[PDB]
Amino acid sequence: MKGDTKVINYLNKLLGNELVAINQYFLHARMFKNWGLKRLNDVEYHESIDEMKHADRYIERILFLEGLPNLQDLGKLNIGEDVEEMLRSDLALELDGAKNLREAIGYADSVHDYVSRDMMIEILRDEEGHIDWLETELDLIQKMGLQNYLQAQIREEG
Amino acid sequence: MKGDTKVINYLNKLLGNELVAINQYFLHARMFKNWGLKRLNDVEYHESIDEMKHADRYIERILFLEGLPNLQDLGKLNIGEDVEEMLRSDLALELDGAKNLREAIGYADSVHDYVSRDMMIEILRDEEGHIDWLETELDLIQKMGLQNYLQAQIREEG
Amino acid sequence: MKGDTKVINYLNKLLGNELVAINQYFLHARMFKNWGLKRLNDVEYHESIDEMKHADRYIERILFLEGLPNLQDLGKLNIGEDVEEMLRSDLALELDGAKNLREAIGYADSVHDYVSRDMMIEILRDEEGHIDWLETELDLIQKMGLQNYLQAQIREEG
Amino acid sequence: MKGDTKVINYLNKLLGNELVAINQYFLHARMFKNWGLKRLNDVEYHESIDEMKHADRYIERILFLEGLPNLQDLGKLNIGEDVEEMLRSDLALELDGAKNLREAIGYADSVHDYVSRDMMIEILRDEEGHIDWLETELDLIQKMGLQNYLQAQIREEG
Amino acid sequence: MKGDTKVINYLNKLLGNELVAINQYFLHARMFKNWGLKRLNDVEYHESIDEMKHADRYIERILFLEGLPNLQDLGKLNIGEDVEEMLRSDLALELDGAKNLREAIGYADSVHDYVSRDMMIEILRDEEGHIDWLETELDLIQKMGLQNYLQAQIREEG
Amino acid sequence: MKGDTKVINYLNKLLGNELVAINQYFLHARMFKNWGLKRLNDVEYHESIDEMKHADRYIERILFLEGLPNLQDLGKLNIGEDVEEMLRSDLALELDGAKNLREAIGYADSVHDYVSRDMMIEILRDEEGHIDWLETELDLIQKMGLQNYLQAQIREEG
Amino acid sequence: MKGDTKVINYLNKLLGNELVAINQYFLHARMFKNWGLKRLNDVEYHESIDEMKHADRYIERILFLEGLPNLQDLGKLNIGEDVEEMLRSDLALELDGAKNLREAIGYADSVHDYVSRDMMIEILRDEEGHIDWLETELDLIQKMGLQNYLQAQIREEG
Ligand code: HEM
Ligand code: HEM
Ligand code: HEM
Ligand code: HEM
Ligand SMILES: [Mn+2]
Ligand SMILES: [Mn+2]
Ligand SMILES: [Mn+2]
Ligand SMILES: [Mn+2]
Ligand SMILES: [Mn+2]
Ligand SMILES: [Mn+2]
Ligand SMILES: [Mn+2]
Ligand SMILES: [Mn+2]
Ligand SMILES: [Mn+2]
Ligand SMILES: [Mn+2]
Ligand SMILES: [Mn+2]
Ligand SMILES: [Mn+2]
Ligand SMILES: [Mn+2]
Ligand SMILES: [Mn+2]
To answer: What ligand 4 atom has the least distance to the C-alpha of F55?
Structure first.
C-alpha cells in the first residue's frame, strides 16, 4: 500500500539510527566481555538484539508502504576506550535517536499514518528504557566508585 | 457490636499511623528501585504491603465495633534525599507508632477489650520486626561503609 | 531523563486523584463486606487494587522524568451512608478524574511526550471500565428495586 | 449439480430470514449484556451463532445447486426497547420464518429434492427449539413478575 | 457514559463498513471452497471471522457511549465472478474502509475520546494486514500465472 | 416382516446400481494408483468402500422385508482410458443412480414405508456428495490444465 | 595476546565482507517475504543469521589478538529487483568473500597462527555451503521455469 514519501524518509532515517546502535552496542558488549565484565556484556548484548529487532520492524514497514529500505549508509560510531566513556556514547546516541523519533511521530499524525505512529511510540517506549539503564549505571560508578563498580560486573546477574 | 469510644479513637489514630507509613515506604521503595538498588526496593516494598495489611485489620475492627474509620487525615511524610537519611525517617516513624501502640494496648485491657488488645500485640510484634531490620541496615552502612553497602544492594537477595 | 514540568504537574495531580480513589473504594469495600454484601465487597476491593496499580505507574513515571511524586496531599473523600449513595460518589469521582485525564493527554501530545500519553490512555481505558460497572449497577437498583438488588449481593459471583 | 429454480428461490428467501435473525439476536444479546443481564446475553448470543450456522448451510446448498446466494437484501429488524418487548420480536420473527420453512419443505418434496428437504427439516427442528425457549421465558416474566425475573438474569446459569 | 454524537456516527459508519465486509468475504470463501480452492476458502473465511469480531467491538462501544448500533443499513456488495476479480473487490473495499478509519481516528483525538481512538487504531492495524495479504496474492497470480496459482490453492497450507 | 413387492423391486434395482459402481470405482482406483496418481487412487478407493456399504444396507433391508437380494445381474461398466474420461463415467453413473433413488423414495412414501425411504434419503445425501467431488475435479482439470492437475495427484493429501 | 598485524588486517577485511552480507541477505529475505515467497524468506533469513555469527567470531578473535574490530566501513550492497537477479548478487558476493578467505588462510599458516586459520577454514566450509544452495536454486529456475519456481516458494518447506 503506497504511503507518503516523508513518512518513508523518516522511517529510513530512524532505521539508520538503529543500524549504528546495533554496531556500537555489539562492539561494546564484546569489549566488556573481553575485559571479564560478564554483567556488562550480557546487558549490552541484549540491547543490541533489541535494536536488531527495532530495525526489522522498520524494514518491513517501509516495504509495506512501498519504499526501499536504505541499509547502505552507516553513521559515525563513537566507541570510547574506557567503560564510563563507552556508556556515555551509548547514552548520547540514544538521546539523539529519541529526538528523531518524536519528530517522526508528530508528522505521521499530521499525515494520518496512525499505524506507523503506533509502532514508533512502541519503539520509543523501548528507547526510553535503554536510556534509563544507562543513566542508572553511570550514577552507580559515581556513587560506589569505579573499582567497586568494576568488581560488581565480573559475574552476570539473574 | 458497639464498643468503647476511646478504643475506637486509639484504633483510628493507629490506622492513621499506618497510612503515613504505607505512603512513605512505597515512595522510598520506588526511589531505591529508581536508583538501581534492587535489594532495598524489594524490602521497603514488602514492608509497605505489611503496613497495608495492618491498616485493613484496623478498618475492619473499627467497623465491627461500630465506629467509622478515618481515612481522610494524612500525616507528615518525612521523605529524605539519601538512603541513610531515608532509612532513619523510616525508623523514627516506626518508633513513634510503637509508642502509640503500647498506650492503646494498656487501655484496651483496662476496658476489657481483649480481642482488640490481642490484634494490636500481633501488629506490635510486626513493627518491632520492621524496627530490627532498619537498625541492622543502618549499622551495616556504618560498619562496611556506604560504597560497599551500595554495591551490596544492586541485586535482590533470596 | 528530565522532562517537562507541566507534564510532571499533570502526572502528580492525576496521582492525587488516584490516592483519594484507593481510599474511598477500600472503605466502601469493607463497609459492604461488613453489611454482608459479598459481591459488592469483592468488586469494590479489586477496583481499589486497580487504582493502587494506577498510582504505582505514575510514581515510577514521575521518578523517571526526574520529578518528585507528591503523596502528601489527600483529597476530600465523599463516603456516603447507603449503597446507592456510596456507588454514586464512586461514579462522580471517576468522572472527575477522567476529565483531568483528557486534559493531561492532550497536553503531553503538544509537548511530544508520547510515552506519558500512551500510559495515560491505558489508564483512561481502565477508568471508563470502572465507569461502566458503576452505571450498570445504579440502573439495576432502579430496575429490580433495592431489596432484590440487596438479596443479589449476599454471595459473590464467579 | 444444477437444480430447480423455485427451490433455489425458497432457499434464498430462507437465507434472508436467517440474516435478519442473526442481526437482531446479536444486537439484543449485547443490549442485555450491557444492562448486566448475563444469562440473557449468553442465550441470545448462542442463538445468533446457531442462525449463523443455519445461513452457512443455505449458502453452500445454493452454491452446489448452482444458484447465487443473495446476501444483499436485509429485512426489517424490529429491535424493541425493553426485554419483554425484545423477546416478543424474537418470537414473532421465528414464527414467520417457520412458516416459510414449511412452505419450502412441501415444495422440495413435490419437486423431489429430498436432500434440500432433509436439511430444512433439521433447521426447522432447531427453530422450533428457539420458539420453545422464548415462549417459556415470556411466561416466566408473567409468572414471577419482572423484578424477580430481572434479578434471575444477572449471573449466567450452567 | 454518554459521549459525543459525531463519534457515535463515525462508529456506526465504520460498523456498516464491517457488515458489508463480513458478507462479501463469507460468500467469496464459500465460492472458493465450492471450486475446490481449499487454501483460499480457509483464508477468506477467517478474515470474515476477523471482521465479525471487529463489528462486535463497535456494537459494544456504541452501546457504552449510549448510542444505538445501526445493523439495518447494508452496503453494496461487489462480488465478482473470477478469483482475480473477487480478490480485487476485497482489496478496494478494504481500502475504502481504512480511509474512513483515518478520518474517524483524527476526530476522536480532537474530541478527546482516546479510548475510542485506541480501539480504532487496533482495528486499523488489522485492516492493513488484510490489505497486505490481498496485495501479495494478486501479485503472485501476476508472477506465476493463473494456472500455477490455481494449482497452488487446492490443499490448505499450515 | 413381509413388505411390498414394488418396494423390494426398487431396492433390488438400486442394489444393482451399487454393484456396478463398486466395480467401476475399484478398477479406476487401481488404474490411477498404477499410473502413480496416489491422491486419485485414495479417493476413488474410499468411494468404492462407501458403495460397498450402501449395498450391504440394501441386502439387509431386502432380507428383513422378506425378499431375495439379486447379486446375479451386473450392469455395463464404462471404464474409460484417460482420467478425464474415467471421472466423467463415474459422474454419469452417479447421476443415473440418483435418478432411480428419487423415483424409489417417492414411491415408498406412497406405500408408507417410511423406514425404507429414510435409509434411501441417507444414501442419496451420500451420492450427492460423490457427485460434488467429481464435478469439482473435472473443473479443476479445466481450470489449471491437465499437466498441473496430474502433478497435483502424485502424493495423497491429508 | 597480541598477534600479527597482517593477520588482524585480514580478519578485519573478512569481517567487513560479513557485514555487507548480513545486510544484503536480510533485505533480500524481507523482500521475498513481502512478495509472499515464504520458502525464500526462511532460507535467506537464516543465512543472514549465519553471517551474523560469522562476524561475532571475527570480532572476538580480533579482540583477543589485541586489535580493534572495524564496524565503521560498510561495502556496496548490490540489491537487485527480481529474484533471479537477487540470488545472483548473493552468489557473486559469496564468491568474492571465499576468495579473500583463501588468501587469509594461507597467510596465517606462514605466520603460524594456526588457531586463526582453524576458525577461518570452519567459516569457509560454511560459505561453500551458502554457495551450493544458491547455485542449485539458480539452476532450478532454469530447469522448471520461473512460474513453477515461484509457485514452489509460497509455503516454507520443512
Ligand atoms: C541490518 C543489520 C542487522 C539486522 C537487521 C539484524 C537482525 C537480527 C535479528 C532480527 C535477529 C534475530 C532476533 C531474535 O533472535 O529475535 C538477529 C540475531 C542476532 N544478531 Fe543480528 N542483525 C544485524 C546486524 C548484526 C551484527 C553487526 C551482529 C554481529 C556482529 C549481529 C549478531 C547477531 C547475533 C549473534 C544474533 C543471535 C543469534 C542466535 O541467538 O541465534 N547482528 N539479528
Ligand atoms: C488506605 C490505603 C491503602 C490500603 C488499605 C491498601 C491495602 C492494600 C491491601 C490489603 C492490599 C492487598 C494485600 C495483599 O496482597 O495481601 C494491597 C495491595 C497493594 N497495594 Fe495497597 N493499599 C493502600 C494504599 C497503597 C498505595 C499508596 C499504593 C500505591 C502507590 C499501594 C500499592 C499496592 C500494590 C502495588 C499492591 C499489590 C498489587 C498486587 O500484587 O496484586 N497501596 N493494598
Ligand atoms: C452482524 C452480523 C454478524 C455478527 C456481528 C457476527 C458475529 C460473530 C462473532 C463475534 C462470532 C464469534 C467469533 C469467534 O468465534 O470468536 C461469530 C462466529 C461465526 N459467524 Fe458470524 N456474525 C455475523 C454475520 C455472519 C454471517 C453473514 C455468517 C454466515 C453466513 C456468519 C457465520 C459465522 C460462523 C460460521 C461463525 C463460527 C461458528 C463456530 O465456529 O462456532 N456470521 N459471528
Ligand atoms: C470387485 C468387487 C469388490 C472388490 C474388489 C472389493 C474389495 C474390497 C476390499 C479390498 C476391501 C477392503 C479389505 C480390507 O478391509 O482389508 C473391501 C471391504 C469391504 N467390502 Fe468389498 N469389494 C467388492 C465387492 C463387495 C460386495 C458385493 C460387498 C457388499 C455387498 C462388499 C462389502 C464390503 C464391506 C462391508 C467391506 C468392509 C468395510 C469396512 O469394514 O470398512 N464388497 N472390499
Ligand atoms: Mn531501537
Ligand atoms: Mn535503544
Ligand atoms: Mn503496621
Ligand atoms: Mn512497621
Ligand atoms: Mn485509576
Ligand atoms: Mn477508576
Ligand atoms: Mn435458523
Ligand atoms: Mn431461530
Ligand atoms: Mn474489520
Ligand atoms: Mn479487513
Ligand atoms: Mn451408493
Ligand atoms: Mn456414489
Ligand atoms: Mn560468513
Ligand atoms: Mn555466506
So the answer is: 30
Distances (CA, A) of D126 to A103, C113, D54, D101: 60, 57, 9, 11
**Cell, residue B103:** 498506650
Distance CA F76, CA F84 (A): 19
Q: How close, in Å, is residue E22 to chain A by CA atoms?
A: 22
* Single-letter code of the amino acid located at C3: G
Per-residue cell: E79 = 462480488
Q: What angle do CA G49, G55, G61 make, to 5 degrees?
A: 145
Give the residue among A80, A78, A82, A83 at the shortest CA–CA distance from A95.
A78
Ligand 4 site-directed mutation target among F19, F49, F123, most atoms within 8 Å of CB: F49
**Domain range spanning residue B26?**
1-158
Q: Please give the Cα distance from A23 to A77 (Å, whole number).
A: 8
Provide CB contacts within 8 A for A113, sequence distance 6+. A3, A4, A7
In total, chain G counts a number of residues equal to 158
Copy the grid coordinates of residue B120: 494490636
A124: closest CA among E102, C108, C12, E99?
Answer: C108
User: Going along chain E, which residue ranges are E strands?
Assistant: none
Q: Judge whether D18 and D51 are in contact, CB under 8 Å.
A: yes
Closest ligand, as measured to the CA of C128: 10
Q: Which three cell numbers stand for residue E136?
A: 501479495
- Sequence-distant (≥ 6) Cβ neighbours of residue E123 within 8 angstroms: E14, E54, E57, E101
Q: Are G107 and G117 in contact (CB under 8 A)?
A: no
What percent of the residues of chain D are helix, what percent strand, and what percent coil, each to the nearest 5?
80, 0, 20
Could you give the number of structural domains in chain G?
1
User: From chain C, which residues contact A within 8 Å (Cβ)?
Assistant: 1, 64, 112, 114-115, 118
Nearest CA among G46, G34, G24 for reference residue G130: G46
Which DSSP state fits E156? Answer: -
Name the method of structure determination.
X-ray
Sorted by sequence, the CB contacts under 8 Å of residue E4 that are 6+ apart come out as E65, E111, E113
C-alpha B105/C-alpha B97 separation (Å) is 12
DSSP C9: H
C-alpha grid cell for residue F75?
A: 450392469
**How much of chain C is helix, strand and coil, in % rounded to 5?**
80, 0, 20
Q: How many CB atoms lie within 10 A of CB A87?
A: 21
For residue E81, how far is the Cα from the chain centroid?
Answer: 20
Of F100, F111, F109, the closest CA to residue F13 belongs to: F100
Given in angstroms, what resolution was this structure solved at? 2.9
Angle CA(C89)–CA(C93)–CA(C99) in degrees, nearest 5? Answer: 150
The rounded distance, in Å, linking the Cα atoms of B70 and B16 is 8
Does the C-beta of F23 come closer than 6 Å to ligand 4?
yes
**How far apart (Å, rounded) are the C-alpha atoms in residues E112 and E4?**
10
Residue A96: which of A131, A125, A71 has the closest Cα?
A131
What's the CA angle centered on F23, arms F19 and F29, to 5 degrees?
140
Tracing cell 566450509 back to the chain, one arrives at G125
Confirm or deny that E28 is annotated as ligand binding.
no
Closest alpha carbon within chain F to E155: F157
Round the CA-based radius of gyration of chain F to a whole number and report it.
17
Neighbours of G157 (CB within 10 A): 9
Cα(D15)–Cα(D6) distance, rounded to whole angstroms? 14
Answer for the pair F84, F147: CB distance below 8 angstroms, yes or no.
no
What is each CA distance from A143 to A139, A151, B146, B147, in whole angstroms? Answer: 6, 14, 9, 7
Cell of C78: 465523599
Domain CATH for D39: 1.20.1260.10
Residue where the block lists cell 472458493: E32
State whether the Cα torsion E140-E141-E147-E151 is positive or negative: positive
Cα separations in angstroms, A48 against A27, A88, F92 = 9, 16, 67
Dist. CA F88 → ligand 16 center (Å)? 13
